[PDB]
Amino acid sequence: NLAPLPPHVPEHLVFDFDMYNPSNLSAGVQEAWAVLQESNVPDLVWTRCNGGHWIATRGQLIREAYEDYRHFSSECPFIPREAGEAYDFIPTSMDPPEQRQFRALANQVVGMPVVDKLENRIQELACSLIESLRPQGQCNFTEDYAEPFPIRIFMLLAGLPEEDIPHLKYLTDQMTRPDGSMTFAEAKEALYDYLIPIIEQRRQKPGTDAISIVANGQVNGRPITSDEAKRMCGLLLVGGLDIVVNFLSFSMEFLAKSPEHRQELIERPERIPAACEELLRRFSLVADGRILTSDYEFHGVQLKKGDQILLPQMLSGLDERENACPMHVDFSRQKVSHTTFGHGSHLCLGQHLARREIIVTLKEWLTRIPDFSIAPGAQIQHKSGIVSGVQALPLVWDPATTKAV
Ligand code: HEM
Ligand SMILES: CC1(C)[C@@H]2CC[C@@]1(C)C(=O)C2
């Protein structure tokens, strides 16, 4: 389904890439997206898919546009437009300066200090989950660990019942990887319907959970409104329940496939933090965009007000000009360049939490289960969207080779 080419788009800049169902998805989602970095593809293209929009394919352009909120606004960050228009999450839907006050509050609930106090619990959860799988000699990593681990830590942070996980997991998936089961606006509304009563209570009888902190916070020297709290909590939920889960699967899929890379970390664990950075670069999984606030000539290309441009955070680190042999995983890369956590004023506020969750997983897993592989005959399926993911990851190992720690 391709939309009619607009009057201002030169035919030679057209490249019909569908971010929700790329071509060589069989080669892996990152590989599927990297086709935009081929020699026969211009730096900036227009795709007639998903309503029609631009795509910046180079790290230089992606970074540039993310710094220029004057022309590239985040008020409409999702494609298709219907989604971007319904998008009202705080603080992402706001451009500076207004966005700044909310970023501070959000940092109070997911910032480093909060993660720090949670360290022992994150560790215990990783160790507990892994140890219970170890004897089995097999597991579907996505649902046996990738999902329960990060999701349980966040439900803990936000003080929400584990009984609500299934519902929230479903809603957040609808927002990042539309199943067609419901529109973004519809999934967002359901999410807000769930959140409103909770924010009301937390405001009356406030606990110590992140929702209670956001709900009774102060911004710009005045109290945050119920509406603002709701819009901020919704983003925190989507960010905390959907991203790390999928990133862990991409990483484990690779490690299950590369024994040499597993050994490297098993022998030199001090190299894990560095390994984390390289994996975050190689298996970057986010891609959203901005909307043109006015007609603008970007690198010789005429952009029109209202035009939407996809600025894939995932593509920057895969760009050959940013990192040599971008597709090769090298834990000793001295210069790991990437925009996996964003760029500009909207830099990810949950970086510390994500890194710790990834680092703790790698360390505790390779400690008890150093040797494992993908169940033979398994075909790992990837999914593309605002946040790309892995359907399932059937793993196997010989229990005689594991160590109870
Ligand atoms: C590996 C996991 C993660 C990745 C790759 C990631 C990536 C991103 C990216 C690329 C953005 C920028 C979006 C834009 O500029 O339009 C972002 C924003 C944000 N992320 Fe993360 N994120 C991750 C995990 C999390 C987690 C764990 C949370 C915590 C709940 C979170 C909370 C946020 C928030 C609140 C923002 C908004 C910041 C702002 O608009 O000023 N993220 N993230
Ligand atoms: C693009 C994102 C990854 C970022 C955090 C969650 C997300 C889906 C948003 O709506 C902002």
From Swiss-Prot:
<dbReference type="GO" id="GO:0005737">
    <property type="term" value="C:cytoplasm"/>
</dbReference>
<protein>
    <recommendedName>
        <fullName>Camphor 5-monooxygenase</fullName>
        <ecNumber>1.14.15.1</ecNumber>
    </recommendedName>
</protein>
<dbReference type="GO" id="GO:0005506">
    <property type="term" value="F:iron ion binding"/>
</dbReference>
<comment type="pathway">
    <text>Terpene metabolism; (R)-camphor degradation.</text>
</comment>
<feature type="binding site" description="axial binding residue">
    <location>
        <position position="348"/>
    </location>
    <ligand>
        <name>heme</name>
    </ligand>
</feature>
<dbReference type="GO" id="GO:0019383">
    <property type="term" value="P:(+)-camphor catabolic process"/>
</dbReference>
<keyword id="KW-0503">Monooxygenase</keyword>
<keyword id="KW-0408">Iron</keyword>
<dbReference type="InterPro" id="IPR017972">
    <property type="entry name" value="Cyt_P450_CS"/>
</dbReference>
<comment type="function">
    <text>Involved in a camphor oxidation system.</text>
</comment>
<keyword id="KW-0349">Heme</keyword>
<keyword id="KW-0479">Metal-binding</keyword>
<dbReference type="InterPro" id="IPR001128">
    <property type="entry name" value="Cyt_P450"/>
</dbReference>
<dbReference type="GO" id="GO:0020037">
    <property type="term" value="F:heme binding"/>
</dbReference>
<dbReference type="InterPro" id="IPR036396">
    <property type="entry name" value="Cyt_P450_sf"/>
</dbReference>
<comment type="similarity">
    <text>Belongs to the cytochrome P450 family.</text>
</comment>
<keyword id="KW-0560">Oxidoreductase</keyword>
<dbReference type="GO" id="GO:0018683">
    <property type="term" value="F:camphor 5-monooxygenase activity"/>
</dbReference>
<dbReference type="InterPro" id="IPR002397">
    <property type="entry name" value="Cyt_P450_B"/>
</dbReference>
<keyword id="KW-0963">Cytoplasm</keyword>
<dbReference type="Pfam" id="PF00067">
    <property type="entry name" value="p450"/>
</dbReference>
